[PDB]
Symmetry: C2
């Protein structure tokens, strides 16, 4: 029967069929060792001279990389085989051969060449591992919020920023965040999350944005920690093979899986960064009141062994909708979660204003057109409750978990100001 | 302890707390009957004069619609209560009152007024039911493909159609479909699906687009049937309450849940439509070679009790990438799945060309710029295998399952050429 490499362990000592591609090939003495990929994994297939028809042995001599292939054989358990299993091949059929030379030979090229060939490069071991971890995270996000009674709530992408021309003279704008709509959602369904593209490194990325009715700042941070540690735990448990293919040290991820994330106020974070900047030539000072520069963010991130929260920034550098700190008028009740190892911010969140007049005056103080926000103001006129939410950047989270050098590797086909292709 | 209405059955005869909103209110004799919503459901709460402090009874006299509320009481099982349960209230605390008159009183307004107030209207019973069914479908899609070893594969939205201005003079275009990228995905991961927004009724909608390596036309239709019948079954099993709130007859959905969907060739469909058009004044004739007009689609859809497949259309009215019918050169191996009851197309799919030169000449015959499709052509140069896929429109599927009058009701904040707000 036809099976997939991913399920090969369930078929030990049976005759099966694989359909896929020649990933690698080597020979020693009377054995050809093929590495086959079928899209769900990589598996050694042996072709043994004298134990298969000579035509089959010779045909298996004759296979360039990315030859498409059907192979038939017996599943063998064998710890000398990478994976722990191999296919003892009995028959083999070429489905197609490359028209030209395949552009990506093993262990050769630099990362940019590989990303220019992204549509082919996705087939290889490292992008395979990254994408399977990405899939694992997206599924696990839906399970995490589904099991807690959250409703997925798709925020609009077109908004009345990148500008889009509509029919006639009309113009719309690509969403940078579904949060405002998610708040309407939270007031209708108690607990919701968007899971969609937003547009601002990457021009285009994916954001999970939960909003919860009656939820406070502190509960908001607790929810963030709960989610991130669950996701790291889930990758550790189910994608340990992919982590291994990436050369990712699980020990760098285990603290995140256990929670108890350290927290810092903005003031404390600034003081810390400026202590670091004195003993360290490669970290510049940080004047109070400014947002964290890239080196500052990195220095904070590398200080801890798991994600670190930074909360209660100055109002002056945050958004109009954020709830003011009740014991400190210059600050708002917000938080950013920083991944360790220099990966930096993976979550941005806050408690939102629930008082009608406060929100009116904030909409003015921030010099905003009140009319366009009237519906948003309705959320305070009718059934207003304290509520909070946040947005998790999927690509930065993937990049961190996988240990990638750049976020563009975390998404199948990245869009950046420079590369917009394929 | 604080609980949600959705979990109320697990807490019979316990003292609990609810946090939510006054949805409706009526009184008879010494009982105030509140209908509370907390975002996860609707629940009767009784306040009994003489058994609660007089202040509490009087406070509960005093509650306009969308008053935000905390209520404490004992969960009672009671079939006279709608839901089968009610809260016997002991204490109650107003969290907030409406600033102004709430614009949506029960059983009053026309659909357009309600959609103009969509951000508030989402709180009510019918949109509640629709959105919970939508959530059920999105979760179930991830489970269906996750359990079959499909990988979620996010296709880019920005493409090199709606036009978007980038920095400098550069321009991109909102994706109308992730299929081309999904094919690269299928060749890398065997079986994939996009789950994302596309842009073309609705300007913006959600598409699940599976692609499978080595999969044929016939298997493609089998996969489509399997998926749709699973989704209908899943809504029937887990959202029967929401279906009931919608007044949706489960009997209209049960045939879809069982599969065995009828199939028609394009030629057969045309002949059928034209037979229908003779006995029926409200169905116009259909010349051979034309795509199905709206009345034709509707007449086909209303002919059957479950979704119907239409396959093997003329090449001349389909896309460049579609595999030609091997026994009939004028036709391609494609299919559209039509929902019954006049809802029409919910899936469009086909087998794709895997032969390199055939695809080159099709790219020319269709007058297309070969350069921009070179990467796509690489998918035929290297590791080319027969493959197929399709796209399921989420909103049309929701609209059909819920029995809605228009697809705009199937998405939280619809974008149409006319309404772009909120």
């Amino acid at each position: 029967m036809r099976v997939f490499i991913d399920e090969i362990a369930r078929h030990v000592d049976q005759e099966v069929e694989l359909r896929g591609w020649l990933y690698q090939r080597r020979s020693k003495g009377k054995i050809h060792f093929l590495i086959l990929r079928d899209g769900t994994g990589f598996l050694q297939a042996t072709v043994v001279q004298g134990e298969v028809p000579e035509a089959v042995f010779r045909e298996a001599d004759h296979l360039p990389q990315e030859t498409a292939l059907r192979v038939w054989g017996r599943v063998r358990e064998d710890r000398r085989a990478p994976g722990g299993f191999e296919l003892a091949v009995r028959d083999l059929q070429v489905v197609s051969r490359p028209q030209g030379e395949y552009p990506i030979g093993p262990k050769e090229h630099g990362i940019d060449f590989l990303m220019d060939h992204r549509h082919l490069w996705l087939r290889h071991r490292r992008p395979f591992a990254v994408m399977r971890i990405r899939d694992e995270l997206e599924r696990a996000i839906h399970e995490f919020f589904g099991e807690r009674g959250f409703l997925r709530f798709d925020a609009p992408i077109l908004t009345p920023l990148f500008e889009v021309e509509l029919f006639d003279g009309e113009k719309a704008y690509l969403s940078q965040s579904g949060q405002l709509y998610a708040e309407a959602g939270a007031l209708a369904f108690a607990k919701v999350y968007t899971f969609g593209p937003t547009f601002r490194h990457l021009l285009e990325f994916w954001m999970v944005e939960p909003e919860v009715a009656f939820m406070t700042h502190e509960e908001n941070m607790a929810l963030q920690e709960e989610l991130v540690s669950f996701l790291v735990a889930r990758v550790l448990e189910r994608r340990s093979r992919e982590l291994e293919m990436l050369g990712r040290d699980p020990k760098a991820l285990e603290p995140a899986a256990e929670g108890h994330y350290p927290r810092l106020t903005y003031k404390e974070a600034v003081a810390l960064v400026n202590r670091i900047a004195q003993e360290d030539p490669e970290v510049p000072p940080l004047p109070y009141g400014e947002d964290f520069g890239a080196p500052h963010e990195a220095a904070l991130s590398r200080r801890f062994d798991r994600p670190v929260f930074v909360e209660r920034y100055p109002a002056r550098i945050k958004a109009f909708y954020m709830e003011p700190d009740p014991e400190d008028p210059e600050l708002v009740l917000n938080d950013d979660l920083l991944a360790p190892e220099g990966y930096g911010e993976i979550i941005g969140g806050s408690q939102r204003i629930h008082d009608l007049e406060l929100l009116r005056r904030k909409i003015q103080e921030f010099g905003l057109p009140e009319e366009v926000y009237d519906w948003y103001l309705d959320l305070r006129r009718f059934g207003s409750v304290p509520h909070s939410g946040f947005g998790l950047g999927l690509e930065r989270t993937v990049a961190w978990i996988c240990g990638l050098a750049h976020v563009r590797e975390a998404i199948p086909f990245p869009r950046m100001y420079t590369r917009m292709r394929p």
